[PDB]
Design a protein around this ligand. Structure first.
Ligand SMILES: *C(=O)N1CC(c2nc(-c3ccccc3)no2)C1
Length: 280
């Protein structure tokens, strides 16, 4: 019934397209975060479409309208593999067009790993508070062993849900998040937590080979993706074209923050993509 794609595992992924009026100047894949879905990028995608970019996305496996057990993945690479399948299909239909990636949180880790796998292939990357760092206690050898032991007997055991108030200072946006039936707000499963640990470890190893141009947007008061991870990405990525913008006191969901932050986020992405699309 709906726009879709069939991944390498035979699973249906729900697809979303925002096609401009005329001929597109570039392609841009939108990569959503953990627990959320592509429908949350409607406004950002309409702005990008207004620059004559063909915006495309899919709900990651186990998310939104895609198939799979909710917030579960055999291996984190499945997400990267599926992004590449979607990118390769779009590029076949639009040959010679530059292709960008836009990722938020876990979607940002997916974008980094997607670009690292194909050096020199992507024109640029927009990262909104990407997942790059593991929490202090969470990644010790003891904690990794304990979680792996737990995973063997209770893989679907929930770590406990987070306070949704840490997502944004915009109370309306916290309320929208809390009432969206396509969002999984259930606590993080032990098996998925291990996969997010794999993601962060793989990101760290990928940084010395990351050369793709990028715009990095980060809130200073982010409790999910600590701002120090954004500084480390600026330092360790080998990219010749890298920009960091810090939003003072802002939380995690920058594109759904207080109007002053959200308007700046939209404007900065608009300018950054526009300058690298005129380049084509
Ligand atoms: C963005 O999509 N993500 C989800 C939020 C996050 N990361 C973690 C986590 C847990 C253990 C090890 C690494 C990362 N929990 O919530 C940022």
């Amino acid at each position: 019934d709906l726009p879709h794609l069939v991944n390498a595992d035979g699973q249906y992924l729900f697809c979303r397209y925002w096609k401009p009026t005329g001929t597109p100047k570039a392609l841009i894949f939108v990569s959503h975060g953990a627990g959320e879905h592509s429908g949350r990028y409607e406004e950002l995608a309409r702005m990008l479409m207004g620059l004559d970019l063909l915006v495309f996305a899919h709900d990651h496996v186990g998310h939104g309208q895609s198939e799979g057990e909710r917030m579960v993945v055999s291996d984190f690479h499945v997400f990267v593999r599926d992004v590449l399948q979607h990118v390769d299909s779009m590029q076949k239909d639009y040959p010679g067009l530059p292709v960008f990636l836009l990722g938020h949180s876990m979607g940002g880790a997916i974008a980094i790993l997607t670009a690292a796998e194909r050096p020199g292939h992507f024109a640029g990357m927009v990262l909104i508070s990407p997942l790059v760092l593991a929490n202090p206690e969470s990644a010790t050898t003891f904690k990794v062993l304990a979680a792996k032991v737990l995973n063997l007997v209770l893989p679907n055991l929930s770590l406990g849900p987070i306070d949704s108030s840490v997502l944004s200072r915009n109370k309306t946006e916290v309320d929208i998040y809390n009432s969206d039936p396509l969002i999984c707000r259930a606590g993080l499963k032990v098996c998925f937590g291990i996969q997010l640990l794999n993601a962060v470890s793989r990101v760290e190893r990928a940084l010395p080979k990351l050369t793709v141009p990028f715009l990095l947007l980060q809130g200073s008061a982010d409790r999910l993706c600590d701002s120090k991870g954004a500084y480390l990405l600026m330092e360790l990525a080998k990219s010749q074209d890298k920009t960091l913008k810090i939003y003072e006191g802002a939380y995690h969901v920058l594109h759904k923050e207080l109007p002053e932050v959200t308007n700046s986020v939209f404007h900065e992405i608009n300018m950054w993509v526009s300058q690298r699309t005129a380049t084509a």
